[PDB]
Structures are given as structure tokens and as C-alpha cells.
A paper describes a structure:
Specifically, we examined three pH points: weakly alkaline (pH 8.0) for host cell docking, weakly acidic (pH 6.5) in the early endosome, and acidic (pH 5.0) in the late endosome. By using three-dimensional (3D) reconstruction with icosahedral symmetry, we determined cryo-EM structures of GNNV VLPs at pH 8.0, 6.5, and 5.0, as well as virions at pH 6.5 and 5.0, with overall resolutions in the range of 2.82–4.36 Å. These results indicate that lowering the pH prompted GNNV particles to undergo gross structural alteration, with VLP and virion structures at the same pH being virtually indistinguishable, affirming the use of VLPs as surrogates of virions for vaccine development. Cryo-EM images revealed a spikier appearance of the GNNV VLPs at pH 8.0 and 6.5 than at pH 5.0. Notably, the diameter of the GNNV particle under acidic conditions (pH 5.0) was smaller (370 Å) than under weakly alkaline (pH 8.0) or neutral (pH 6.5) conditions (380 Å). This reduced size is due to an ≈5 Å displacement of the protrusions toward the capsid shell, with radial density and cross-sectional analyses showing that the shell size remained virtually unchanged. Moreover, the shell morphology was relatively unperturbed by the acidic conditions. Closer examination of the protrusions revealed that not only were they positioned closer to the shell in the acidic pH but they also became more compact and were rotated clockwise by ∼20°. By mimicking those conditions encountered en route of host cell entry via the endocytic pathway, we discovered that the protrusions on the GNNV capsid adopts an erect/rising position with loose configuration at the docking condition (pH 8.0) and early endosome condition (pH 6.5), but compact and rest on the capsid shell at the late endosome condition (pH 5.0). Structural comparison shows that the crystal structure of GNNV22 resembles the cryo-EM structure at pH 5.0, suggesting that the crystal structure probably best represents an intermediate structure that a GNNV particle adopts in the late stages of virus entry, but less likely to be the form of GNNV interacting with host cell receptors as has been implicated.
Author numbering:
A (entry chain C), B (entry chain C): 31 to 335
C (entry chain A), D (entry chain B): 52 to 335
E (entry chain C): 114 to 226
F (entry chain A): 170 to 226
G (entry chain C): 31 to 57
Write the structure that this text describes.
């Protein structure tokens, strides 16, 4: 036995097994990117069926596993569009995968140009084997999407759909996560931009419709999904004797959507992280204000929660 | 080329790559189960420092990866208690891992009996290499914890701590997930029981303290963590002319805790999943009611959100 | 492979310098090298996604009369976002050349041979290899006509097709516009202090990422800010070739310009509407 | 060639922490690893544009008595955009260490070998290999002085000269500044909640991307929201190291600061003047 | 020479330029061989020094009569009185025999104030 | 770094004489193409690199 | 790496190169 060790002032810390997590996890699987139901006669040429950026948040199992890593590298991406309609359905669809996540264009030529794009009748399935970069993209969101996304998928109606068509854009993904870390589950999502424009006189007393903002994800958001505005929203109201204060709100969320507008209506307010609560401000009151734009095109909307 | 295929009424679905996700993922790592700060003179023998059930929710990276699988099997569990105090600190700690998740006992004998338990002075670290079953436990919560947990860790103060002691109970885990599936992120947590008892006359007009319920996780819960009562809470109030209706609430959540009681105060209410919102009912009003017990000992509290 | 090695000469820009405006550190040419300044590369980068610069050799052709003794310094900043227009910054960069207005020199800089993108993005550092800057050392006795030739050999890849607007380049303001010094219904680019904004063509509109608060009178000494996000450009005059910018709602959906509302410039506290670093992007 | 290999040891940061203020989760050092931090590399990144970290090895050297109680967990988050200040974030990353205060450990982090831009830019991941974070594990008994030495080996390239303003690292505020939270003429940096801003030297004037919107009095009730951008650090007293931030104007050329109007103190509904992510950059 | 309870640190370096009269942590740490350590821990500075035949007698320029200078700085705030000794191990190789006067063999000093 | 004698700090000095009077103001810029070979890593102060001047009259 | 050394009350003095001057010089 050993009993010859004197007692020092303090002993060296013996936390040896620290910072030794696994780095590589070759996660794989298949999932549904999107599913759409095209009404008859509304599939006019140029209509965008599915416009989905392929970030590790669309993929659910990858979404819950990209938060325990930081850098992923796509190793096998193969989308498989599957329509479900009888052979009597008349019309065609073109599918493509733009390798540039910032290329927001919806035309037949742009889709067909990209390698791997397909054109087929609505009663015939296809497989888009696209070109995708193998560089180590970043899981967490950033200023530029080009470092956090291999690309985006676009599906377009070529002809005029005779009847309602149910289309599902499946995806096969084989990613290789690396650089172990613990990303926060929020700020892991994808930033969204306001294609439309929001006016001061396009505001109600309390609410405002999402279809005005012109972004589909803003139009379809679950109740309680509080969004973040990079650009301030300066609401007008009468604080006192017509005191038109430009009340600055950055936090927008979708309250219970109005039945009249399925796209729904946001409110402006305070989203307190310390309380994780949404407190509404003074209702909009356009007293004396020349028309103006409050949220311009391209206002980035990221969901704080 | 082939052009001899006639056009049938409908073509066979060609969704081949379906239901083929990876089944085995040998996830591993190290994490901190709990961390405690014992004040001087309050570490009297028998005081429980850490009492933590080892479910795949305590482990964060495993917690975000046990929701994409269903059955895990622990392959290497080795807790490493690390105190941080000078050699002048007087007192001792005993650490053990009860292999029975339902064994809720806190004594020196029970801890020391189990294989792998350690006893050491407060200025000396140790490693608990315990006995743990290799059977395929279930990730999701169920009626019995014995199928969803390898065991629980207990840490106890043997002597009387002379000064404040900061202790961290690290854990090294190497699980082997299997049976691919997509568990919901809620109902993946661990059920909790009310060690204490909640009385009708131990209720305020609106709130009630958590320390009455006698459960530490109930005492420390973030604001907005809505809990579920298996047993109904029949609040008393005056609906009309002393109309004492036994208003049944199953949903309890921790509003902003009162500064006077750090353990805080729950409210009774409705947690609507369709709205995901907490609506409070009529405030408690004991008009004419003999004393009674509303939430007895053992009332299971699982957090709906 | 899909690589297409295009190479050809092109004129980056044409610049006119009025007689006597060659102040200290005056920027004659501030041209970001995006695949639009080059016409052939402009038409050939619309059919590809990634382009890599393999050769770049600028050349100045000052058509100023030999009578003028004003000087010019030419350089290529390899950082597209670099907003430095000082002599030292140019002269440090590889290939920078100094001469007089009657002399013509060449520039052979050290570009970065990495796979840039052919479409605009949030940062210019993945879309352009750099920016040509041509300062006028001293004042010019005669109007200076400047033409800067480019010799590029790009290496395109990743076939695709894009829209003309997607290849445009943003602009940054080198000056801080002040409320106390602001015309009621417009303002010239001198306040902004950016050379591309100085030479901004009439008809272009720039979106200020900062809140363009125009402070209209509510009456009786009370005023109210009005937030805008657009800046229509109008031609100025011979005295001030800078031009004018007017605020309002450049509603590109209607392509109609709500003119700049009345600015009640009486007692606005001293503020900067657009501090140094404010950016402007032509909506087109 | 032009791949200058410069390697040396230097101190990124030093922090003094008083007794009793070492509650778990406190951020002793939160330093983004840009060349501006390292002195020798700081004087060698102003003469180059792109660098590639080839060897990085931080070593924490605390100078405190042996008979002290408390620990320091140190880690290197490989993602500069990451702003996590919890023990979980550090314990997840590779190379993290934990030890008693009198101990000196070595952090062997996981960085990126890709070329990075010395100059600051909008998207930080091209300019920094990560951020070093050092947290207290428990309450410290006495004052602790810690120095985070850094051993680096970079490979600079692309010669060019940069202004000292450009090489400065931008730090985003961790907190949300509310209208009711303001004082008369300034506000404490605790509301910002960012350690680099808290330990910023007095007089370090910053510019904020988010427009600080302080209302100015119109005379009778009527509210007009002035927009002020530049902020100046005002020395932190003994009680509050955070100092203060007086709103106003910092002239670029003149290097002069301005103090704005007093905050409009009335029944204004609560607003977010500066949300989390309000970038601040040293214009000085 | 202080107990382990002494709080504070010292940085030691050897500037190879005898005329470099600068006292900062960065300048010391930059030079090869510099060390940083707590006040209760000894160190060894193995520096970079020129092998050229320097001159023993004083002259107008110190750079021909000195391999360099040593600087020691307090990094932190010393809690108690600290007694420090900067020992040196030297192995010189004298040459060019002559008889220098014992005065004018010393080192010139400058008035900082 | 600067010292008592400039002979160990600089390689020389450019001198540009004007032979005859100028009818017009002469603006002169002298370009340099240098390829130095640094060594002995250290760090110094800005003033330490300055150069003295000598009076010719 | 070695990090298993406890912190004693005081450390042994490490002045090794002491009293080792050259003895013989044939001047
Ligand atoms: Ca991240
Ligand atoms: Ca289940
Ligand atoms: Ca593109
Ligand atoms: Ca640069
Ligand atoms: Ca002599
Ligand atoms: Ca020197």
C-alpha cells in the first residue's frame, strides 16, 4: 500500500474526461419536404407549388440532431417527387434544385437549366438527382444563407391542371455532422424575408394581415411563433393630444388568425426573453401621417420562438 | 429504346425508399447531472445533495437524440463526483447509484449497500462505477419508471460541512439507441411525484406555494412550464350565493414566482393544446368547507409543456 | 468538365472630372468588379453560378490634356467591402501606380483565386474579387476623361440561369448626412459622400437599411418622424453634378415615386440620419 | 511567395475579478479571436488581408493564492456567431478544461484551417475562428487575476494596408434595452449584457447598427422619436464597472463626440429601443 | 521567494535590442523565450542573443557593446511583499588582448526626466 | 529601431536635386520597390522607428 | 500532460546552478 503522500494545500483537479464528445455522426434517412394540393384550374403556368430551402430544419430528425453539432456536409441528396392523381389528369410539372440558396427566381427556364431538373406529366413520378456542394456548411443560422444551405428545391406547374392534384416532394438525405457543440434550439431556424411591403395605411387599429407581407411562411405560422424584425416597425398612435410617437417594435407574432383571412394577422409587441412573454403595445392610430412604408421588401423575419 | 408499354388506368406507386431509417446510433459523451452549493452548517448528516433519476432527458445531447429513437440500452455509465473546496474543508459525502428507479430512500446504509458506492472527504473526488442493466429500456415516459430508467444517483452529506461546498456530479454515458421512430418532444420528459400534501386551507385566494407539494422539481421550475395532474384538483369558490363548486383543474403551471418564497407558486387553470394557452379559472374562495386534502402524496406531475 | 474559360478585354467605366474639382483624395473612379461592369462577362455570368478569377490586369487611359499637371493614383483593393479611399491604402496594395494626367499606367494586382458566386448576396466578399479605386492627387486645370480597361480571364462553373437584377452590387456611404444640413424636399450626394452615389444615374432608387426618418411638422412646434426606405435619384445641375436624392415610397409594384414630403427643418436636434457605414442598394 | 508565416505567443486578454462576484455562469473573459486581439499579429494583420490559423493553443494563467476556492471552465466555441454563455456550451465543445483557480491549464481547441479575412465584415464566420469563453464554476474566495495567454501560428497573404478602425471586432449586445429602462442622459452597459462592452475602455466610442431611438420633447405632450446612433463609453465607477453610454454623434474626420437630448420621460408605452444583437463597433 | 499564498504574476523577457527602452507586457511577451508565471513559481528565460564579437569598452552605440537587456514586470497586483532575484548564467569568450582602463569601461546612462 | 548612428538603421537616402528653375510648380512623387528580409521577432513603439535630421547651414 | 501534482504549502527552491564557477585558469 502507498501512504507516503503528504497533504498539500490543494490537490490538482482530476476532471479528465472533459471535452471529448464524438465528432462524426453519419446520420441519414428520408423525409417529406413539402406536400401541396393544387385546385383544378389554379395550376396556371408559373405558379410555384413547392419553394423550399433545404436547411437542416426542414428535415425533422436532422433538425433535432443538428442542434448537437455545428458543421454538416451533405453527402447524398436525391429528391423524389411523387404525385397522386389518375392518368386522366392533364398537366405537367417541372422540378429542380437551385444550388444557390439566394437565387429566388421562379421560371421554367431557370429550373430546366440546372443539372438534374425534370419535366413530367402530373401522373408520372420522377427523381431529381441534383448537383450539391460537399463543403462543410454551418448548421446555425447566419447573415449569409450560402454557408448554411446546399440549395433550394423549386416545383412548378408547366401546364394547366385539369383536376386537383396532390403532390409530395420527398427527399433522401445523408449528412455527416461534425464539430461537436450545443447549439441553442432557437436561432437554429432559417431566416425569412418579406417579399411584399407593409404600409402605415395598410395597418388596422390592432392587427395586420400576413398576406400583405408577401411571404408564405409568414402567411402560415402556428399561433405563438414569435418572429423577429431586423428592421424596426414604427407604429403610429395618439399617445396624448395627437402625440404621434413612432413606437418601435421588433417583435411580431401570429395571434389567432382571423377566419376571414386564412393567411392571418400579426401583432406588434414586446417579446421578453426573461419572461418569454408577448406584451402588446398601444393600438395603431393613424392620426395625421402621410403615407409611408414601415416594413420594406426584404425585411428579415426570424422566429425568436 | 422501349415504347411498347401500354397506358393502364393507373400506375403502381414507386415510393421505394420508405421506412428505411438507420436503427443503431452509438451515441456517447459526458455531461453534468447536477451541481449544488451547500452552505456552511446546513450539510447536517442525512441531507440530500443530489437526487437525480438518470433518464435520457437529464443528458442534453441524448435528450435531443432520444426523441428520434424509442429504445436505448445503456452500455457504459460511470459517474464522477467532483467537489471544489480547499483541504481545510471538514466533512464527507457518500455517493451511490440505486439500480431501482422507484427506490426513493435517502440513508447512508441504503447508499453504501449498493455496489460501487463511495465515501470520501469533501476535498477528495471519486468515481462511482455502478451496476446497471443492459436491457432495452424505453425512451418515452410510461406508467412504470423501471422500464425507462437504469437507476438513480444519490449524494449525501456524511458529516457536517465546515464551509460552503460546491459539488458537481458529472456523468459519462455511452448509450445505444435503436427502434427508429419520431417521439413527440413533449411526453418525453420524466414524471414527478408530490412528496408533500396540498390542503384546501393551505391554498391562497389565487396561488399556492410549491414547497407545500414537497417536490424539488416543482419548487424549481421555469416560468411557463405547464404541469399535468393525474389526480383532479377540485378548487373551492363562490360561484353564486356561496355556490361551492368543486372546480376540476388538471393543469398547474408556475407563474412568476413570489420573491418571498423562492420555491414559488403554481396556479390552477386550463392548458389548451389547440391554443397552447393557460387560462385561469375562478380564484379560490373557501366559503364553508371542512378541511380536506386535494392533491395527496404521490400525485404525478408531468409537464405538458 | 463544366469549366468554361472566358477571357476578353473590356472598359470598366468612363469618368468625367470637372476642371478644378480634383481636391485632396478625390475619388475619380470607385468601381467594384462584379460580373456586370464587364459586358461579355455580364452576359456570360447570367448562365453560371460560380466564377473564379484567374487573371486580372487593369489599365488607366487618362484622356486629360497634357497641359494639366494633376496626378492620379490607381489601385485594386482585394476586399470588396473595403471602404478606404486614402493614398496609403492604395499604394500599399500590389500593383498600385502613380503618375500624372498625361501619363498612362497599368495595374497588375494580387487577386484571390477562390470560387466566388455570380449572384448578389448579403456580403460582397463572395461575389467580387475587389474594387478598382483611382484617386486624383491634385486639382485639374482641364476636364479629365478617364477610361479604365480590364483584362479578365474568369473560369465559370455550375451551369444555371439567372435574372439581370441578381448580379447588381450594393453601395456604401462614406459620409454622415445631417438633419441640420438638409434640403427640404431632397439632398445631393455630397452629404452621402459616396462616389457611386455621386455618379448614380437618374432613375435609380436606393434603399437605406437605416430608418430614413423625414420629420414632417405636426404643427405648433410639434414634429413627427416619418420612416421611409427608398431614395429616388434625380439629376442635379452643372454647378453641383452630384445630383439629388428624394425620399418617399418608391413602390416598385406601381413603379410610382411618392415625392419627398415636406421636411420641417426648424428645430430638429442635431442628429445623423445616416451615420458613416450606411449602405444603399439600387432596387432596379 | 506571399504566405508569410508569423508565429508567436501573446496575451489575448486579462481580467481582474473581485471576491464574492464569481457566481456560477459569470463570464470572466468572452473574447472573439480576431488578430486585433493579439498584439504582434495585430501589427501584422494591418499589412495583410487574408490569414489562415495553422496552430492555436490557448493557456489560462491565473495568478491567485493556492489556498483559494473556485474553478474556471474555459472553452473555445468554433462558431463566432454563437453567443452562448452557459457551462453546457463549453462542456460540449472539444478542448474545454475545468480546474481550480490556482491552476494553469492548456486549451487545445478545434479551429478552422480555411483562409479568413483580417478586415471585419458583415458575416463574422469569415473573419474569426471562434471565441474563447472563461466562466466561473463557483464563488471565488478572494480577488483573482487571470491572463489568457495565446500561442498562434498564422499564414498571412494578399498584401494591403488597413485602417485600425476596420480591423476592430464588432460585438453584439446580449440584452434588450427598453424605453422605460433609460436614465436621463445615458444608460448602464449591464442592460446591454455583453462582457466585451462591459470591459471596454472609457471613451471607446461605438456605432450601433440598430438605431437608438430616444424621443425628444416637442414642448407639450407631443412625442417625436429622435434617432441617435453614436455611443460613447463613460468610465465605470467602483460600484458599477459597466460605465454609461451617452447617446449622440461621433464625427468621423473630426473625432469629436456629441451628447444628445435627455430621454423623454413620460407615459410612453414600453418599446424595445435596442434588441439583442445590436452590433457595436469601435469607430475610434 | 514568497509563499504560495502570494497572489500576482510576473513576466520576464530579454529584449535583444539594447536601445529598446519600452516597458509593456506585449513587448516582453513577443520576444522569444519570455515567460509569464505566478509570483510563487520560478522560471528560466532562455533568450535569443547574437554571437557577434561585441566590444567590452563603452562607445557611442550600445548595440555594439551589449547582447541585450532584461526586463521583469508585475502582471497582476502583488498581495504581499515579494523578494525577487534575477540570476544569470553567462559563458563569454573574451578575445583581442589589451589593457582597457578600468574607468570608461562602465555603461552610459541617460536622463529619462 | 532608431539609434545614435543611422548607419545601422537605414540603407541610405534618396536625393533629388533640381538642376534649374521651374517655370511651373513641380509636383514630385518618388516610388520605391523594396524587398526586405525581416528577422528576430519582437514588438516596438511607433516613435522608436523615427529618423534624425541634420542642419546644412 | 501532467496535472496530478497537488499544491503544497511551499515548493522546494530550484536554484541549481549555484556555486559552480570555474576553478582553474592558466593565465
Ligand atoms: Ca452556431
Ligand atoms: Ca414512445
Ligand atoms: Ca445565383
Ligand atoms: Ca480588407
Ligand atoms: Ca576600448
Ligand atoms: Ca528595436
Amino acid at each position: 500500500r502507498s501512504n507516503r503522500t503528504d497533504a498539500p494545500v490543494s490537490k490538482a483537479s482530476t476532471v479528465t474526461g472533459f471535452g471529448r464528445g464524438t465528432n462524426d455522426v453519419h446520420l441519414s434517412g428520408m423525409s417529406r419536404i413539402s406536400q401541396a394540393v393544387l385546385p383544378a384550374g389554379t395550376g396556371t403556368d408559373g405558379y410555384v407549388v413547392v419553394d423550399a430551402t433545404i436547411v437542416p430544419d426542414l428535415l425533422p430528425r436532422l433538425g433535432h440532431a443538428a442542434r448537437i453539432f455545428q458543421r454538416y456536409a451533405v453527402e447524398t441528396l436525391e429528391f423524389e417527387i411523387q404525385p397522386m392523381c389518375p392518368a386522366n389528369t392533364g398537366g405537367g410539372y417541372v422540378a429542380g434544385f437551385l444550388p444557390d440558396p439566394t437565387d429566388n427566381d421562379h421560371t421554367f427556364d431557370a429550373l430546366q437549366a440546372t443539372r438534374g431538373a425534370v419535366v413530367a406529366k402530373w401522373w408520372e413520378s420522377r427523381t431529381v438527382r441534383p448537383q450539391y456542394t460537399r463543403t462543410l456548411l454551418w448548421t446555425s443560422s447566419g447573415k449569409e444563407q450560402r454557408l448554411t444551405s446546399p440549395g433550394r428545391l423549386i416545383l412548378l406547374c408547366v401546364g394547366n391542371n385539369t383536376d386537383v392534384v396532390n403532390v409530395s416532394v420527398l427527399c433522401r438525405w445523408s449528412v455527416r455532422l461534425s464539430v461537436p457543440s450545443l447549439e441553442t434550439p432557437e436561432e437554429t431556424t432559417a431566416p425569412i424575408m418579406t417579399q411584399g411591403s407593409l404600409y402605415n395605411d395598410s395597418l388596422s387599429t390592432n392587427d395586420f394581415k400576413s398576406i400583405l407581407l408577401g411571404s408564405t411562411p409568414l402567411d402560415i405560422a402556428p399561433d405563438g411563433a414569435v418572429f423577429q424584425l431586423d428592421r424596426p416597425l414604427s407604429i403610429d398612435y395618439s399617445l396624448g393630444t395627437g402625440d404621434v410617437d413612432r413606437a418601435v417594435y421588433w417583435h411580431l407574432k401570429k395571434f389567432a388568425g382571423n377566419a376571414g383571412t386564412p393567411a392571418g394577422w400579426f401583432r406588434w409587441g414586446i417579446w421578453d426573453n426573461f419572461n418569454k412573454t408577448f406584451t402588446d403595445g398601444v393600438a395603431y392610430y393613424s392620426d395625421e401621417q402621410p403615407r409611408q412604408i414601415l416594413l420594406p421588401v426584404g425585411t428579415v423575419c426570424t422566429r425568436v420562438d
